[PDB]
Design a binder for this molecule. Structure first.
Ligand SMILES: CCCCCCC/C=C/CCCCCC(=O)OC[C@@H](O)CO
Ligand SMILES: CCCCCCC/C=C\CCCCCC(=O)OC[C@@H](O)CO
Ligand SMILES: CCCCCCC/C=C\CCCCCC(=O)OC[C@@H](O)CO
Ligand SMILES: CCCCCCC/C=C\CCCCCC(=O)OC[C@@H](O)CO
Ligand SMILES: CCCCCCC/C=C\CCCCCC(=O)OC[C@@H](O)CO
Ligand SMILES: CCCCCCC/C=C\CCCCCC(=O)OC[C@@H](O)CO
Ligand SMILES: CCCCCCC/C=C\CCCCCC(=O)OC[C@@H](O)CO
Ligand SMILES: CCCCCCC/C=C\CCCCCC(=O)OC[C@@H](O)CO
Ligand SMILES: CCCCCCC/C=C\CCCCCC(=O)OC[C@@H](O)CO
Ligand SMILES: CCCCCCC/C=C\CCCCCC(=O)OC[C@@H](O)CO
Ligand SMILES: CCCCCCC/C=C\CCCCCC(=O)OC[C@@H](O)CO
Ligand SMILES: CCCCCCC/C=C\CCCCCC(=O)OC[C@@H](O)CO
Ligand SMILES: CCCCCCC/C=C\CCCCCC(=O)OC[C@@H](O)CO
Ligand SMILES: CCCCCCC/C=C\CCCCCC(=O)OC[C@@H](O)CO
Ligand SMILES: CCCCCCC/C=C\CCCCCC(=O)OC[C@@H](O)CO
Ligand SMILES: CCCCCCC/C=C\CCCCCC(=O)OC[C@@H](O)CO
Ligand SMILES: CCCCCCC/C=C\CCCCCC(=O)OC[C@@H](O)CO
Ligand SMILES: CCCCCCC/C=C\CCCCCC(=O)OC[C@@H](O)CO
Ligand SMILES: CCCCCCC/C=C\CCCCCC(=O)OC[C@@H](O)CO
Ligand SMILES: CCCCCCC/C=C\CCCCCC(=O)OC[C@@H](O)CO
Ligand SMILES: CCCCCCC/C=C\CCCCCC(=O)OC[C@@H](O)CO
Ligand SMILES: N[C@@H](Cc1ccccc1)C(=O)O
Length: 448
């Protein structure tokens, strides 16, 4: 009977939904940094480019931090399917804001909306993929890999389309294309959802019991009150610049996993919990490097590469393109190597080494040719090829979302150090350290 690549037909609906959401997001991010440079150039937005680069990073960090609680809100309060729909609506509006005839003023509002929207939609659409299968079903792992392919397909075509559009018709038109993308996603999700998805997920699957509401309400209130108290104090002492607020967001994001580990520490498994701290750190650093591709490598693409024959934002398509191209080989590998099954601990270690190699590679063109000229595009092609090899190896969801969020929070401080004069040193040292720490994990691997 009829399937979607051997899978339940509902997967097709979820496939397209997340593909288009990812289209809207990565299409936006492929030109967002350049947009801020533009606003800076016209004098409309008073920050340095270092700060603009910092904003791209903490933006990404908040988006995934939002996703750490999205599953909770859906499962306990509003339902997974409404979470996805209304999350999509918030994302679309966020994009519409940037298409409207405003400048810097629209930036904050657009970002907030998308942070909130993605937090609702992203974990829950992935959760919905699991709902197509029973606990028992074998196909479950194949389904998610297809889902991941869709994620990268959307991520792949968006820079091409949106980038071309910005150069031809301008930023507002381009941003509107991103909005249209999310809209298309909503249409297919809504009508395809009604046809192909279990109505059980129109409502929360674990609703709050009567005695759970008040303590939850206390919990969120204290967290919000405390967060706001700090902002009050920050203004009192004069720590009120945008870099100061970004520093606040970095800390909060980093504090969360620290506080989590630090007091959820029977000798049976205090060790076992402590065993995964190296694997979390490894993921954090790899995602840090991978996420800099839309910031540091995006800067290198615009400034240091001679690609005068197509929009420079197209370079953002290389990351997901390599994911798709690698899928065939890695599919073969996991089938073919039945015995091998290398450990998650060294998978993380090797993946980190590739990411560190990808940066060491980028140190070479500046070392060889100097930094005042322009080099071949294949340097970036080579850099993406290396880092994506790591990703294939690396591939709770909250914890996954957390790892990425922490990496991007780290980037928000690191990417400010990147500039023309720093270029080689930047790449050589953050590249080298990643290889070393990757190898350090190779010592403590089964000392675990
Ligand atoms: C999606 C981005 C893929 C980038 C792949 C680029 C592969 C091409 C590398 C050769 C570029 C060297 C110089 C560029 C070029 O051929 O045209 C420029 C020159 O003809 C000016 O008239
Ligand atoms: C207007 C602000 C936009 C919202 C920013 C995103 C939300 C920020 C902080 C809430 C995250 C709370 C983290 C607690 C949590 O359960 O997630 C981590 C959990 O997996 C621990 O392992
Ligand atoms: C419509 C208003 C938009 C903002 C509302 C949605 C903001 C996100 C969450 C609101 C508080 C939910 C509490 C999240 C939480 O308790 O995390 C649970 C944690 O244990 C994760 O497993
Ligand atoms: C700016 C846009 C404002 C909102 C426009 C869309 C609102 C119109 C009707 C509300 C539809 C509610 C759908 C919520 C939902 O759970 O849909 C889930 C989907 O799977 C339907 O089966
Ligand atoms: C518990 C709540 C966690 C708080 C998380 C804070 C997330 C809210 C906003 C983050 C936005 C990222 C930076 C956006 C930004 O600086 O753009 C505004 C600026 O360009 C306008 O001059
Ligand atoms: C290079 C981009 C075009 C490649 C073909 C894209 C065609 C779009 C959808 C059809 C493929 C969707 C399923 C993807 C897929 O079969 O992945 C294979 C592997 O991941 C098995 O899970
Ligand atoms: C379906 C409703 C949500 C989806 C978005 C629909 C709106 C998207 C495009 C409609 C036209 C956008 C306006 C484009 C625009 O005016 O910017 C270009 C112009 O301002 C620059 O000179
Ligand atoms: C100026 C640009 C337009 C600003 C307002 C845009 C609002 C237009 C459409 C919102 C999209 C609604 C979500 C699409 C959808 O599938 O809902 C259909 C469902 O409600 C049918 O009952
Ligand atoms: C912070 C943004 C304001 C929007 C409200 C977010 C509320 C976040 C946390 C408090 C959750 C308590 C309300 C839960 C609720 O609606 O109960 C419904 C049902 O489960 C009662 O049994
Ligand atoms: C969930 C907490 C809600 C508290 C409402 C107030 C939180 C406001 C902002 C959250 C952090 C973003 C700070 C970015 C910002 O406002 O930039 C300020 C900048 O204009 C200084 O010149
Ligand atoms: C939960 C108890 C609260 C304890 C204090 C919470 C954390 C204390 C301070 C947060 C640091 C805020 C960011 C620091 C900052 O503003 O940087 C200043 C510097 O950039 C000058 O603009
Ligand atoms: C007793 C609690 C465990 C031991 C304390 C561990 C400290 C917990 C959280 C610290 C947050 C990490 C610092 C954030 C950070 O590195 O950013 C630095 C920068 O943003 C400051 O301007
Ligand atoms: C799959 C293997 C790919 C290997 C790519 C990485 C190659 C390993 C190391 C690259 C060396 C970069 C160091 C650059 C350097 O020496 O700095 C030069 C500096 O003195 C001039 O400013
Ligand atoms: C996992 C498999 C990875 C194998 C990749 C092997 C990588 C080999 C060399 C990478 C370093 C790049 C060499 C630098 C280079 O080619 O510059 C010379 C070029 O400018 C010629 O004019
Ligand atoms: C498996 C590695 C493939 C080959 C990668 C070898 C990378 C090592 C060095 C790259 C050459 C660096 C450029 C030459 C260089 O920096 O000379 C020093 C010069 O800056 C002094 O003025
Ligand atoms: C599927 C590939 C995985 C391994 C990729 C490793 C590639 C490492 C280096 C290749 C790119 C660096 C050399 C690029 C290069 O040759 O510069 C272009 C040269 O023609 C100067 O114009
Ligand atoms: C044959 C099928 C398996 C393919 C194995 C993957 C091949 C590994 C690396 C390919 C990247 C090319 C190496 C980069 C390179 O040598 O550039 C040299 C360039 O400077 C020549 O002018
Ligand atoms: C278990 C949680 C993992 C935490 C991993 C994060 C590592 C801890 C702190 C990172 C702080 C990085 C600060 C780097 C720095 O200050 O330099 C950049 C600064 O110049 C920005 O202008
Ligand atoms: C156990 C010894 C460490 C083994 C790590 C293996 C990493 C492979 C190649 C690393 C090449 C180092 C590149 C030279 C370097 O980093 O100098 C920094 C210089 O570029 C300053 O800008
Ligand atoms: C153990 C977890 C490590 C996570 C944080 C790793 C990065 C933290 C700090 C590195 C930046 C501190 C300053 C180092 C530095 O000078 O690098 C910049 C330099 O390469 C540019 O000239
Ligand atoms: C400067 C020389 C550059 C080349 C250095 C790269 C190779 C150097 C060290 C890699 C081997 C580290 C030893 C890993 C090891 O076997 O430790 C034991 C571990 O397997 C048990 O978990
Ligand atoms: N490239 C990934 C980034 C990511 C990693 C982990 C969690 C969430 C997002 C994606 O678009 O899905």
């Amino acid at each position: 009977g009829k399937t979607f690549f051997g899978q339940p037909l509902g997967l097709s609906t979820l496939f397209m939904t997340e593909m288009w959401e990812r289209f809207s997001y990565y299409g936006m991010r492929a030109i967002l940094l350049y947009y801020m440079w533009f606003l800076i150039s016209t004098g409309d937005l008073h920050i340095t480019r270092a700060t603009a680069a910092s904003i791209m990073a903490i933006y990404a960090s908040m988006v995934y931090l939002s996703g750490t609680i999205g599953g909770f809100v859906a499962d306990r309060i509003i339902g997974a399917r409404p979470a996805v729909f209304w999350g999509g609506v918030l994302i679309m509006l966020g994009h519409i804001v940037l298409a409207l005839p405003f400048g810097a003023s629209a930036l904050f509002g657009s970002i907030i909306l998308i942070i909130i929207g993605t937090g609702f939609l992203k974990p829950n659409v992935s959760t919905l993929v699991g709902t197509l299968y029973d606990e028992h079903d074998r196909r479950r792992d194949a389904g998610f890999s297809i889902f991941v392919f869709g994620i990268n397909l959307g991520a792949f075509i968006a820079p091409l389309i949106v980038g071309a559009a910005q150069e031809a018709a301008g930023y507002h038109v381009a941003f509107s294309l991103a909005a249209i993308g999310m809209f298309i996603g909503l249409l297919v999700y809504y009508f395809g959802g009604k046809k192909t998805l279990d109505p059980h997920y129109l409502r929360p699957t674990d609703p709050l019991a009567p005695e759970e509401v008040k303590p939850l309400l206390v919990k969120v209130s204290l967290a919000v009150a405390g967060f706001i108290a700090i902002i009050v104090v920050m203004n009192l002492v004069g720590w009120n610049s945008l870099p100061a607020y970004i520093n606040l967001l970095t800390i909060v994001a980093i504090a969360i996993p620290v506080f989590y580990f630090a007091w959820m520490i029977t000798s049976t498994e205090h060790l076992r919990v402590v065993s995964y701290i190296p694997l979390f750190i490894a993921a954090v650093l790899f995602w840090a490097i991978e996420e800099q591709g839309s910031v540091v490598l995006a800067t290198f693409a615009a400034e240091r590469v001679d690609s005068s024959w197509f929009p420079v934002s197209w370079f953002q398509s290389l990351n997901p393109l390599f994911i798709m191209l690698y899928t065939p080989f890695f599919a073969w590998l996991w089938t073919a190597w039945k015995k091998n099954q290398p450990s998650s601990p060294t998978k993380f270690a090797v993946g980190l080494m590739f990411a560190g190699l990808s940066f060491l590679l980028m140190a070479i063109p500046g070392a060889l040719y100097g930094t005042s000229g322009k080099v071949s595009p294949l340097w970036l092609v080579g850099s993406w090829a290396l880092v994506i090899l790591g990703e294939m190896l690396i591939s709770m969801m909250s914890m996954w979302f957390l790892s990425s969020s922490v990496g991007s929070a780290l980037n928000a401080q690191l990417v400010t150090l990147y500039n023309a004069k720093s270029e080689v040193a930047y790449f050589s040292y953050f590249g080298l350290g990643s290889v070393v720490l990757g190898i350090v994990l190779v010592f403590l691997s089964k000392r675990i």
